[PDB]
């Protein structure tokens, strides 16, 4: 059976999977779960993913509940021998390391910020606090890009797909003007054909955040 | 060259790596980084890991800055063909899925709670809020254990090592009375010889948290076997 992707394209991790699907030309059935209607809490979805999170992938009997597992699974099944998920161990571990940085550091801080807006309203968020936390993430990624054109080495990998969507999301609020390597990398990522998969959901997130948070991004 | 682990045993992700190192009898050089003295911001360590986090592994030219990459790398290098990081694709993805649950959900909520204690003092923490967030993680893990004997399947995997350290940390505060599958699984993990690598750092974390947060964990909460 073909993979089924439960998604809300406002989610950056969802968009990372949409980018990989477009890049690899994977035939996938999309199923929309409206997060702002709480549809991730529907009984059948909760039974599928008790974390009530998107993306969720069902591929035969395999149920994956994290974008980084989905990216790795789809690359191993549909891009065997490719460069996105390198076969050499040391290169593959470096890609894994940056996927985990996205999960544990960049997305965590991006999510803390956006969730504060949704829960408290923009006017009640300590913007300077989150600017510091997310600027530290920029500084780190700027250092990652010192030696290489891409996040995990000289070529595009799953790590770039994971990071670029969340970065595009934080960039709605905090510009990359002070980080030349990171701004160069982002501009290059935007020139990928597969980057078109990020556009619609980013804009829908922009609109939804501005309405629910009662503010406007700069 | 032998792996070098930069570590503070009070960190649950560090303890997950320490458990794997003991289980596989890997010879590793330990290099202590005291998180509560701010040694992770020393210029040389920041250059090595700009996320200023432990565990950090240096193995030859490879530098890993996340416990879940370290667990996978060490399993592939010293448990080749083993079952901790299974060779069949679907089983391996399930282990990876639960590793990421620990990183994205359980540890995130456990860290939010402990960080608030250190930053604010326990008396100024919204403990009820964090009890709800961490009880929800308990429910999710109970659901996983209702469908499988261990976290990711019928046998011990890297996912159990990653999750048990953070679970034991959360359970210093919040009891597992209402979670029979979690209690049975946790008791089984505590029977492992490798669990010795979790005991000491858990106790040191308990002492440090009580000191810095000016409070006491409820002694009845922690599951002891
Ligand atoms: N680490 C997870 C993060 C998944 C996640 O948090 N998704 C958010 C949207 S960005 C979500 O589904 N929120 C719904 C909820 O938590 O109830 C991954 O990479 O897939
Ligand atoms: N996802 C990372 C989390 C690492 C982490 O946050 N470690 C904490 C200790 S539990 C740390 O080093 N804190 C020091 C700091 O952030 O300055 C992993 O699994 O290794």
């Amino acid at each position: 059976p073909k993979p089924i992707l439960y998604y809300d394209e406002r989610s950056p991790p969802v968009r990372s999977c949409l980018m990989l699907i477009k890049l690899l030309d994977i035939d996938v059935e999309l199923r929309f779960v409206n997060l702002f209607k709480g549809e991730q809490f529907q009984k059948d979805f909760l039974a599928l993913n008790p974390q009530h999170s998107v993306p969720t992938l069902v591929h035969g009997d395999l149920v994956l509940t994290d974008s980084h597992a989905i990216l790795i699974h789809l690359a191993e099944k549909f891009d065997e021998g490719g460069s996105l998920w390198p076969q050499e161990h040391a290169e593959r571990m470096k890609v894994l390391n940056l996927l985990l940085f996205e999960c544990s550091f960049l997305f965590r801080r991006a999510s803390d910020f956006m969730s504060a807006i949704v829960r408290q309203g923009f006017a009640n968020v300590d913007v300077a606090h989150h600017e510091r936390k997310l600027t530290e993430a920029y500084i780190i990624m700027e250092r990652y890009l010192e030696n290489s054109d891409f996040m995990a080495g000289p070529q595009l990998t799953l790590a770039d797909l994971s990071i670029v969507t969340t970065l595009s999301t934080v960039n709605l609020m905090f510009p990359l003007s002070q980080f030349p390597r990171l701004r160069r990398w982002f501009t290059a990522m935007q020139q990928l054909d597969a980057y078109e998969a990020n556009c619609s959901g980013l804009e829908k997130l922009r609109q939804t955040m501005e309405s629910v948070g009662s503010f406007q991004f700069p």
Side-chain angles (χ1 to χ4, degrees), chain A residues 1-42 44-60 62-76 78-79 81-86 88-90 92-93 95-142 144-146 148-177 179-183 185-195 197-218:
Chain A
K2 71 169 127 202
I4 303 162
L5 182 76
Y6 292 86
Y7 83 101
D8 184 320
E9 64 264 73
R10 290 170 287 207
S11 157
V14 160
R15 285 180 264 127
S16 293
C17 296
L18 298 177
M19 285 185 54
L20 180 64
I21 287 169
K22 184 174 185 57
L23 181 49
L24 296 184
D25 276 46
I26 308 180
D27 182 25
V28 175
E29 179 186 341
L30 301 175
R31 289 183 183 174
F32 181 54
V33 179
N34 194 328
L35 293 180
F36 286 83
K37 299 288 292 182
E39 294 187 349
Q40 71 273 30
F41 293 109
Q42 195 271 336
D44 293 315
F45 191 74
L46 268 183
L48 197 59
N49 176 14
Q51 294 170 74
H52 49 86
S53 77
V54 291
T56 293
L57 194 83
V58 179
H59 195 185
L62 183 63
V63 180
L64 306 177
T65 56
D66 188 281
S67 68
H68 311 88
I70 295 167
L71 291 172
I72 287 171
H73 167 76
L74 289 177
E76 291 188 352
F78 297 99
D79 197 39
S83 55
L84 289 169
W85 185 230
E88 193 275 309
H89 177 78
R92 181 167 291 197
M93 294 299 102
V95 170
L96 180 58
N97 197 63
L98 279 138
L99 286 172
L100 289 160
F101 158 83
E102 196 280 337
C103 185
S104 166
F105 201 99
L106 180 59
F107 180 85
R108 181 181 182 180
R109 282 155 187 235
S111 162
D112 288 339
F113 177 54
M114 299 289 176
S115 296
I117 299 176
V118 165
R119 162 176 19 92
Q120 302 152 213
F122 184 82
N124 296 307
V125 170
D126 188 349
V127 170
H129 164 81
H130 293 284
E131 173 159 21
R132 289 190 291 279
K133 296 283 294 279
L134 288 153
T135 295
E136 174 174 9
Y138 287 179
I139 292 166
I140 290 173
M141 288 183 284
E142 182 78 5
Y144 284 152
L145 289 168
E146 165 142 24
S148 55
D149 283 339
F150 294 92
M151 285 289 170
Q155 293 164 240
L156 177 85
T157 66
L158 300 178
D160 302 287
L161 309 181
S162 180
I163 287 162
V164 74
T165 60
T166 301
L167 180 64
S168 87
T169 301
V170 182
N171 182 59
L172 295 173
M173 183 69 201
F174 302 116
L176 309 177
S177 42
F179 306 91
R181 299 196 285 252
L182 185 56
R183 194 165 59 98
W185 171 87
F186 186 46
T187 300
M189 291 298 300
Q190 282 171 314
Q191 311 315 309
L192 291 172
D193 280 353
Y195 184 79
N198 190 61
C199 292
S200 164
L202 177 63
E203 171 63 15
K204 288 169 169 55
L205 184 55
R206 167 194 285 281
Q207 295 156 357
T208 296
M209 290 302 304
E210 285 184 348
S211 148
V212 173
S214 313
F215 80 113
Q216 296 195 350
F217 290 101

PDB file of all heavy atoms in Angstrom, chain A residues 8-37:
ATOM      1  N   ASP A   8      -1.040  18.804   8.565  1.00  0.00           N
ATOM      2  CA  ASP A   8      -1.541  20.175   8.512  1.00  0.00           C
ATOM      3  C   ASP A   8      -0.353  20.988   8.018  1.00  0.00           C
ATOM      4  O   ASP A   8       0.657  21.077   8.723  1.00  0.00           O
ATOM      5  CB  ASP A   8      -2.021  20.646   9.893  1.00  0.00           C
ATOM      6  CG  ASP A   8      -2.647  22.042   9.874  1.00  0.00           C
ATOM      7  OD1 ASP A   8      -2.139  22.939   9.173  1.00  0.00           O
ATOM      8  OD2 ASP A   8      -3.654  22.242  10.582  1.00  0.00           O
ATOM      9  N   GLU A   9      -0.438  21.550   6.806  1.00  0.00           N
ATOM     10  CA  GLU A   9       0.769  22.126   6.211  1.00  0.00           C
ATOM     11  C   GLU A   9       1.258  23.380   6.929  1.00  0.00           C
ATOM     12  O   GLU A   9       2.346  23.865   6.608  1.00  0.00           O
ATOM     13  CB  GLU A   9       0.563  22.425   4.720  1.00  0.00           C
ATOM     14  CG  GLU A   9      -0.482  23.481   4.407  1.00  0.00           C
ATOM     15  CD  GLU A   9      -1.825  22.874   4.078  1.00  0.00           C
ATOM     16  OE1 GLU A   9      -2.489  22.380   5.010  1.00  0.00           O
ATOM     17  OE2 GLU A   9      -2.208  22.879   2.887  1.00  0.00           O
ATOM     18  N   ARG A  10       0.509  23.904   7.904  1.00  0.00           N
ATOM     19  CA  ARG A  10       1.062  24.968   8.739  1.00  0.00           C
ATOM     20  C   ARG A  10       2.239  24.465   9.572  1.00  0.00           C
ATOM     21  O   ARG A  10       3.114  25.253   9.952  1.00  0.00           O
ATOM     22  CB  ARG A  10      -0.030  25.552   9.641  1.00  0.00           C
ATOM     23  CG  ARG A  10      -1.068  26.363   8.868  1.00  0.00           C
ATOM     24  CD  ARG A  10      -2.279  26.736   9.723  1.00  0.00           C
ATOM     25  NE  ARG A  10      -3.133  25.582   9.987  1.00  0.00           N
ATOM     26  CZ  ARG A  10      -4.438  25.656  10.224  1.00  0.00           C
ATOM     27  NH1 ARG A  10      -5.048  26.836  10.230  1.00  0.00           N
ATOM     28  NH2 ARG A  10      -5.131  24.551  10.458  1.00  0.00           N
ATOM     29  N   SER A  11       2.298  23.166   9.836  1.00  0.00           N
ATOM     30  CA  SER A  11       3.365  22.613  10.670  1.00  0.00           C
ATOM     31  C   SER A  11       4.674  22.561   9.883  1.00  0.00           C
ATOM     32  O   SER A  11       4.694  22.015   8.770  1.00  0.00           O
ATOM     33  CB  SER A  11       2.948  21.225  11.163  1.00  0.00           C
ATOM     34  OG  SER A  11       4.062  20.423  11.514  1.00  0.00           O
ATOM     35  N   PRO A  12       5.766  23.141  10.387  1.00  0.00           N
ATOM     36  CA  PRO A  12       7.056  23.059   9.674  1.00  0.00           C
ATOM     37  C   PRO A  12       7.505  21.621   9.465  1.00  0.00           C
ATOM     38  O   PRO A  12       7.939  21.274   8.355  1.00  0.00           O
ATOM     39  CB  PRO A  12       8.026  23.832  10.586  1.00  0.00           C
ATOM     40  CG  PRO A  12       7.164  24.738  11.380  1.00  0.00           C
ATOM     41  CD  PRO A  12       5.822  24.054  11.544  1.00  0.00           C
ATOM     42  N   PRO A  13       7.437  20.745  10.484  1.00  0.00           N
ATOM     43  CA  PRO A  13       7.820  19.342  10.233  1.00  0.00           C
ATOM     44  C   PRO A  13       7.001  18.679   9.142  1.00  0.00           C
ATOM     45  O   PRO A  13       7.534  17.856   8.389  1.00  0.00           O
ATOM     46  CB  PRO A  13       7.596  18.671  11.594  1.00  0.00           C
ATOM     47  CG  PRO A  13       7.772  19.744  12.565  1.00  0.00           C
ATOM     48  CD  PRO A  13       7.156  20.951  11.918  1.00  0.00           C
ATOM     49  N   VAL A  14       5.715  19.016   9.035  1.00  0.00           N
ATOM     50  CA  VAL A  14       4.914  18.525   7.915  1.00  0.00           C
ATOM     51  C   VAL A  14       5.515  18.994   6.595  1.00  0.00           C
ATOM     52  O   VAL A  14       5.712  18.206   5.665  1.00  0.00           O
ATOM     53  CB  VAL A  14       3.450  18.979   8.059  1.00  0.00           C
ATOM     54  CG1 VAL A  14       2.732  18.908   6.709  1.00  0.00           C
ATOM     55  CG2 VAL A  14       2.731  18.143   9.104  1.00  0.00           C
ATOM     56  N   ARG A  15       5.842  20.285   6.504  1.00  0.00           N
ATOM     57  CA  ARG A  15       6.370  20.816   5.249  1.00  0.00           C
ATOM     58  C   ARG A  15       7.696  20.170   4.868  1.00  0.00           C
ATOM     59  O   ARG A  15       7.974  19.985   3.677  1.00  0.00           O
ATOM     60  CB  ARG A  15       6.501  22.338   5.349  1.00  0.00           C
ATOM     61  CG  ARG A  15       5.141  23.031   5.243  1.00  0.00           C
ATOM     62  CD  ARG A  15       5.244  24.549   5.349  1.00  0.00           C
ATOM     63  NE  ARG A  15       4.999  25.027   6.707  1.00  0.00           N
ATOM     64  CZ  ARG A  15       5.820  25.830   7.376  1.00  0.00           C
ATOM     65  NH1 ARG A  15       6.953  26.240   6.821  1.00  0.00           N
ATOM     66  NH2 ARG A  15       5.507  26.224   8.600  1.00  0.00           N
ATOM     67  N   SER A  16       8.515  19.799   5.854  1.00  0.00           N
ATOM     68  CA  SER A  16       9.746  19.076   5.551  1.00  0.00           C
ATOM     69  C   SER A  16       9.439  17.776   4.819  1.00  0.00           C
ATOM     70  O   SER A  16      10.113  17.422   3.844  1.00  0.00           O
ATOM     71  CB  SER A  16      10.508  18.795   6.846  1.00  0.00           C
ATOM     72  OG  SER A  16      10.979  20.001   7.422  1.00  0.00           O
ATOM     73  N   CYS A  17       8.400  17.066   5.268  1.00  0.00           N
ATOM     74  CA  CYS A  17       7.997  15.825   4.621  1.00  0.00           C
ATOM     75  C   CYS A  17       7.396  16.089   3.245  1.00  0.00           C
ATOM     76  O   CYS A  17       7.624  15.315   2.306  1.00  0.00           O
ATOM     77  CB  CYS A  17       7.003  15.080   5.514  1.00  0.00           C
ATOM     78  SG  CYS A  17       7.714  14.551   7.108  1.00  0.00           S
ATOM     79  N   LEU A  18       6.625  17.172   3.104  1.00  0.00           N
ATOM     80  CA  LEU A  18       6.092  17.525   1.790  1.00  0.00           C
ATOM     81  C   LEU A  18       7.215  17.845   0.812  1.00  0.00           C
ATOM     82  O   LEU A  18       7.135  17.506  -0.376  1.00  0.00           O
ATOM     83  CB  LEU A  18       5.131  18.711   1.906  1.00  0.00           C
ATOM     84  CG  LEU A  18       3.879  18.498   2.764  1.00  0.00           C
ATOM     85  CD1 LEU A  18       3.049  19.778   2.865  1.00  0.00           C
ATOM     86  CD2 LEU A  18       3.018  17.346   2.243  1.00  0.00           C
ATOM     87  N   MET A  19       8.275  18.495   1.294  1.00  0.00           N
ATOM     88  CA  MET A  19       9.419  18.790   0.437  1.00  0.00           C
ATOM     89  C   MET A  19      10.105  17.508  -0.020  1.00  0.00           C
ATOM     90  O   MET A  19      10.445  17.356  -1.200  1.00  0.00           O
ATOM     91  CB  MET A  19      10.403  19.699   1.177  1.00  0.00           C
ATOM     92  CG  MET A  19       9.938  21.134   1.284  1.00  0.00           C
ATOM     93  SD  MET A  19      11.188  22.197   2.033  1.00  0.00           S
ATOM     94  CE  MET A  19      12.595  21.856   0.988  1.00  0.00           C
ATOM     95  N   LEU A  20      10.321  16.570   0.905  1.00  0.00           N
ATOM     96  CA  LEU A  20      10.946  15.310   0.521  1.00  0.00           C
ATOM     97  C   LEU A  20      10.074  14.552  -0.470  1.00  0.00           C
ATOM     98  O   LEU A  20      10.581  13.952  -1.427  1.00  0.00           O
ATOM     99  CB  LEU A  20      11.218  14.456   1.760  1.00  0.00           C
ATOM    100  CG  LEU A  20      11.882  13.112   1.462  1.00  0.00           C
ATOM    101  CD1 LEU A  20      13.256  13.354   0.862  1.00  0.00           C
ATOM    102  CD2 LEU A  20      11.983  12.251   2.725  1.00  0.00           C
ATOM    103  N   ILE A  21       8.755  14.576  -0.260  1.00  0.00           N
ATOM    104  CA  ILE A  21       7.841  13.872  -1.156  1.00  0.00           C
ATOM    105  C   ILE A  21       7.915  14.468  -2.556  1.00  0.00           C
ATOM    106  O   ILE A  21       7.930  13.745  -3.561  1.00  0.00           O
ATOM    107  CB  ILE A  21       6.410  13.914  -0.585  1.00  0.00           C
ATOM    108  CG1 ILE A  21       6.292  12.984   0.628  1.00  0.00           C
ATOM    109  CG2 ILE A  21       5.380  13.538  -1.649  1.00  0.00           C
ATOM    110  CD1 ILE A  21       4.991  13.161   1.415  1.00  0.00           C
ATOM    111  N   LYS A  22       7.983  15.795  -2.643  1.00  0.00           N
ATOM    112  CA  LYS A  22       8.119  16.448  -3.939  1.00  0.00           C
ATOM    113  C   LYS A  22       9.483  16.163  -4.557  1.00  0.00           C
ATOM    114  O   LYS A  22       9.586  15.908  -5.764  1.00  0.00           O
ATOM    115  CB  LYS A  22       7.887  17.951  -3.774  1.00  0.00           C
ATOM    116  CG  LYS A  22       7.899  18.752  -5.072  1.00  0.00           C
ATOM    117  CD  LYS A  22       7.514  20.203  -4.804  1.00  0.00           C
ATOM    118  CE  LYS A  22       7.387  20.999  -6.098  1.00  0.00           C
ATOM    119  NZ  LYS A  22       6.400  20.376  -7.029  1.00  0.00           N
ATOM    120  N   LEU A  23      10.538  16.176  -3.739  1.00  0.00           N
ATOM    121  CA  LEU A  23      11.887  15.952  -4.251  1.00  0.00           C
ATOM    122  C   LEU A  23      12.040  14.545  -4.821  1.00  0.00           C
ATOM    123  O   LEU A  23      12.620  14.362  -5.897  1.00  0.00           O
ATOM    124  CB  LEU A  23      12.905  16.200  -3.138  1.00  0.00           C
ATOM    125  CG  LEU A  23      14.395  16.049  -3.446  1.00  0.00           C
ATOM    126  CD1 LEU A  23      14.768  16.816  -4.709  1.00  0.00           C
ATOM    127  CD2 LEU A  23      15.202  16.544  -2.254  1.00  0.00           C
ATOM    128  N   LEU A  24      11.514  13.544  -4.124  1.00  0.00           N
ATOM    129  CA  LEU A  24      11.658  12.150  -4.519  1.00  0.00           C
ATOM    130  C   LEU A  24      10.541  11.658  -5.431  1.00  0.00           C
ATOM    131  O   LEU A  24      10.595  10.507  -5.878  1.00  0.00           O
ATOM    132  CB  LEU A  24      11.718  11.257  -3.276  1.00  0.00           C
ATOM    133  CG  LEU A  24      12.906  11.435  -2.331  1.00  0.00           C
ATOM    134  CD1 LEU A  24      12.845  10.393  -1.226  1.00  0.00           C
ATOM    135  CD2 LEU A  24      14.230  11.342  -3.080  1.00  0.00           C
ATOM    136  N   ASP A  25       9.538  12.491  -5.713  1.00  0.00           N
ATOM    137  CA  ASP A  25       8.372  12.095  -6.508  1.00  0.00           C
ATOM    138  C   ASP A  25       7.713  10.841  -5.933  1.00  0.00           C
ATOM    139  O   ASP A  25       7.521   9.836  -6.621  1.00  0.00           O
ATOM    140  CB  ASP A  25       8.751  11.885  -7.977  1.00  0.00           C
ATOM    141  CG  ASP A  25       8.754  13.175  -8.774  1.00  0.00           C
ATOM    142  OD1 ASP A  25       9.313  14.179  -8.288  1.00  0.00           O
ATOM    143  OD2 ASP A  25       8.200  13.185  -9.893  1.00  0.00           O
ATOM    144  N   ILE A  26       7.376  10.901  -4.648  1.00  0.00           N
ATOM    145  CA  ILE A  26       6.730   9.787  -3.957  1.00  0.00           C
ATOM    146  C   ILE A  26       5.221   9.924  -4.099  1.00  0.00           C
ATOM    147  O   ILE A  26       4.665  11.006  -3.881  1.00  0.00           O
ATOM    148  CB  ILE A  26       7.121   9.748  -2.471  1.00  0.00           C
ATOM    149  CG1 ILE A  26       8.635   9.784  -2.291  1.00  0.00           C
ATOM    150  CG2 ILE A  26       6.546   8.501  -1.812  1.00  0.00           C
ATOM    151  CD1 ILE A  26       9.070   9.737  -0.835  1.00  0.00           C
ATOM    152  N   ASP A  27       4.556   8.824  -4.444  1.00  0.00           N
ATOM    153  CA  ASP A  27       3.097   8.786  -4.475  1.00  0.00           C
ATOM    154  C   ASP A  27       2.594   8.531  -3.059  1.00  0.00           C
ATOM    155  O   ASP A  27       2.805   7.448  -2.502  1.00  0.00           O
ATOM    156  CB  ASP A  27       2.612   7.711  -5.446  1.00  0.00           C
ATOM    157  CG  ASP A  27       1.099   7.659  -5.558  1.00  0.00           C
ATOM    158  OD1 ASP A  27       0.439   8.684  -5.292  1.00  0.00           O
ATOM    159  OD2 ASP A  27       0.566   6.586  -5.911  1.00  0.00           O
ATOM    160  N   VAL A  28       1.939   9.530  -2.471  1.00  0.00           N
ATOM    161  CA  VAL A  28       1.462   9.477  -1.094  1.00  0.00           C
ATOM    162  C   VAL A  28       0.022   9.965  -1.063  1.00  0.00           C
ATOM    163  O   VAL A  28      -0.339  10.905  -1.779  1.00  0.00           O
ATOM    164  CB  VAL A  28       2.334  10.340  -0.154  1.00  0.00           C
ATOM    165  CG1 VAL A  28       1.758  10.367   1.253  1.00  0.00           C
ATOM    166  CG2 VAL A  28       3.754   9.851  -0.135  1.00  0.00           C
ATOM    167  N   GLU A  29      -0.802   9.335  -0.233  1.00  0.00           N
ATOM    168  CA  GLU A  29      -2.142   9.841   0.028  1.00  0.00           C
ATOM    169  C   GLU A  29      -2.083  10.835   1.184  1.00  0.00           C
ATOM    170  O   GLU A  29      -1.640  10.488   2.285  1.00  0.00           O
ATOM    171  CB  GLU A  29      -3.114   8.710   0.351  1.00  0.00           C
ATOM    172  CG  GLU A  29      -4.521   9.214   0.659  1.00  0.00           C
ATOM    173  CD  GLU A  29      -5.461   8.116   1.116  1.00  0.00           C
ATOM    174  OE1 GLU A  29      -5.160   6.930   0.869  1.00  0.00           O
ATOM    175  OE2 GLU A  29      -6.504   8.442   1.724  1.00  0.00           O
ATOM    176  N   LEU A  30      -2.537  12.062   0.937  1.00  0.00           N
ATOM    177  CA  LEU A  30      -2.587  13.092   1.968  1.00  0.00           C
ATOM    178  C   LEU A  30      -3.940  13.087   2.663  1.00  0.00           C
ATOM    179  O   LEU A  30      -4.984  13.000   2.011  1.00  0.00           O
ATOM    180  CB  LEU A  30      -2.333  14.472   1.361  1.00  0.00           C
ATOM    181  CG  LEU A  30      -1.012  14.697   0.632  1.00  0.00           C
ATOM    182  CD1 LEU A  30      -0.993  16.077  -0.009  1.00  0.00           C
ATOM    183  CD2 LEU A  30       0.166  14.542   1.591  1.00  0.00           C
ATOM    184  N   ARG A  31      -3.918  13.208   3.990  1.00  0.00           N
ATOM    185  CA  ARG A  31      -5.135  13.298   4.793  1.00  0.00           C
ATOM    186  C   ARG A  31      -5.004  14.475   5.750  1.00  0.00           C
ATOM    187  O   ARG A  31      -4.136  14.470   6.627  1.00  0.00           O
ATOM    188  CB  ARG A  31      -5.394  11.996   5.556  1.00  0.00           C
ATOM    189  CG  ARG A  31      -5.831  10.856   4.639  1.00  0.00           C
ATOM    190  CD  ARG A  31      -6.155   9.578   5.391  1.00  0.00           C
ATOM    191  NE  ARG A  31      -6.485   8.506   4.452  1.00  0.00           N
ATOM    192  CZ  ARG A  31      -6.702   7.238   4.790  1.00  0.00           C
ATOM    193  NH1 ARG A  31      -6.624   6.861   6.058  1.00  0.00           N
ATOM    194  NH2 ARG A  31      -6.997   6.345   3.852  1.00  0.00           N
ATOM    195  N   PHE A  32      -5.872  15.469   5.590  1.00  0.00           N
ATOM    196  CA  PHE A  32      -5.753  16.722   6.328  1.00  0.00           C
ATOM    197  C   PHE A  32      -6.335  16.581   7.728  1.00  0.00           C
ATOM    198  O   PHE A  32      -7.462  16.104   7.900  1.00  0.00           O
ATOM    199  CB  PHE A  32      -6.457  17.852   5.571  1.00  0.00           C
ATOM    200  CG  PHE A  32      -6.371  19.196   6.252  1.00  0.00           C
ATOM    201  CD1 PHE A  32      -5.144  19.733   6.617  1.00  0.00           C
ATOM    202  CD2 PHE A  32      -7.517  19.930   6.510  1.00  0.00           C
ATOM    203  CE1 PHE A  32      -5.067  20.973   7.239  1.00  0.00           C
ATOM    204  CE2 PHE A  32      -7.445  21.173   7.134  1.00  0.00           C
ATOM    205  CZ  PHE A  32      -6.218  21.693   7.496  1.00  0.00           C
ATOM    206  N   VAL A  33      -5.554  16.997   8.722  1.00  0.00           N
ATOM    207  CA  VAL A  33      -5.954  17.031  10.126  1.00  0.00           C
ATOM    208  C   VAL A  33      -5.854  18.486  10.564  1.00  0.00           C
ATOM    209  O   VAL A  33      -4.747  19.014  10.720  1.00  0.00           O
ATOM    210  CB  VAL A  33      -5.064  16.133  11.003  1.00  0.00           C
ATOM    211  CG1 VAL A  33      -5.496  16.206  12.470  1.00  0.00           C
ATOM    212  CG2 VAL A  33      -5.082  14.699  10.502  1.00  0.00           C
ATOM    213  N   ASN A  34      -6.994  19.144  10.755  1.00  0.00           N
ATOM    214  CA  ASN A  34      -6.982  20.574  11.056  1.00  0.00           C
ATOM    215  C   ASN A  34      -6.617  20.783  12.523  1.00  0.00           C
ATOM    216  O   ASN A  34      -7.448  20.576  13.412  1.00  0.00           O
ATOM    217  CB  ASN A  34      -8.331  21.208  10.729  1.00  0.00           C
ATOM    218  CG  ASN A  34      -8.261  22.723  10.707  1.00  0.00           C
ATOM    219  OD1 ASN A  34      -7.477  23.327  11.443  1.00  0.00           O
ATOM    220  ND2 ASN A  34      -9.072  23.346   9.855  1.00  0.00           N
ATOM    221  N   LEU A  35      -5.377  21.223  12.773  1.00  0.00           N
ATOM    222  CA  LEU A  35      -4.892  21.373  14.143  1.00  0.00           C
ATOM    223  C   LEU A  35      -5.627  22.472  14.894  1.00  0.00           C
ATOM    224  O   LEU A  35      -5.771  22.395  16.120  1.00  0.00           O
ATOM    225  CB  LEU A  35      -3.395  21.680  14.152  1.00  0.00           C
ATOM    226  CG  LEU A  35      -2.431  20.594  13.675  1.00  0.00           C
ATOM    227  CD1 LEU A  35      -0.995  21.098  13.767  1.00  0.00           C
ATOM    228  CD2 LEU A  35      -2.609  19.323  14.484  1.00  0.00           C
ATOM    229  N   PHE A  36      -6.074  23.510  14.197  1.00  0.00           N
ATOM    230  CA  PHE A  36      -6.734  24.595  14.907  1.00  0.00           C
ATOM    231  C   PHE A  36      -8.218  24.335  15.122  1.00  0.00           C
ATOM    232  O   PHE A  36      -8.889  25.150  15.764  1.00  0.00           O
ATOM    233  CB  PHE A  36      -6.478  25.913  14.177  1.00  0.00           C
ATOM    234  CG  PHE A  36      -5.069  26.418  14.360  1.00  0.00           C
ATOM    235  CD1 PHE A  36      -4.037  25.940  13.565  1.00  0.00           C
ATOM    236  CD2 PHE A  36      -4.767  27.334  15.358  1.00  0.00           C
ATOM    237  CE1 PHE A  36      -2.741  26.382  13.744  1.00  0.00           C
ATOM    238  CE2 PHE A  36      -3.468  27.781  15.542  1.00  0.00           C
ATOM    239  CZ  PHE A  36      -2.454  27.303  14.735  1.00  0.00           C
ATOM    240  N   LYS A  37      -8.735  23.211  14.631  1.00  0.00           N
ATOM    241  CA  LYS A  37     -10.021  22.688  15.067  1.00  0.00           C
ATOM    242  C   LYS A  37      -9.859  21.537  16.052  1.00  0.00           C
ATOM    243  O   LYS A  37     -10.852  20.899  16.417  1.00  0.00           O
ATOM    244  CB  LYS A  37     -10.854  22.241  13.863  1.00  0.00           C
ATOM    245  CG  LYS A  37     -11.181  23.355  12.886  1.00  0.00           C
ATOM    246  CD  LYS A  37     -12.205  24.330  13.449  1.00  0.00           C
ATOM    247  CE  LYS A  37     -13.569  23.677  13.597  1.00  0.00           C
ATOM    248  NZ  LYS A  37     -14.581  24.642  14.102  1.00  0.00           N
TER     249      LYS A  37
END
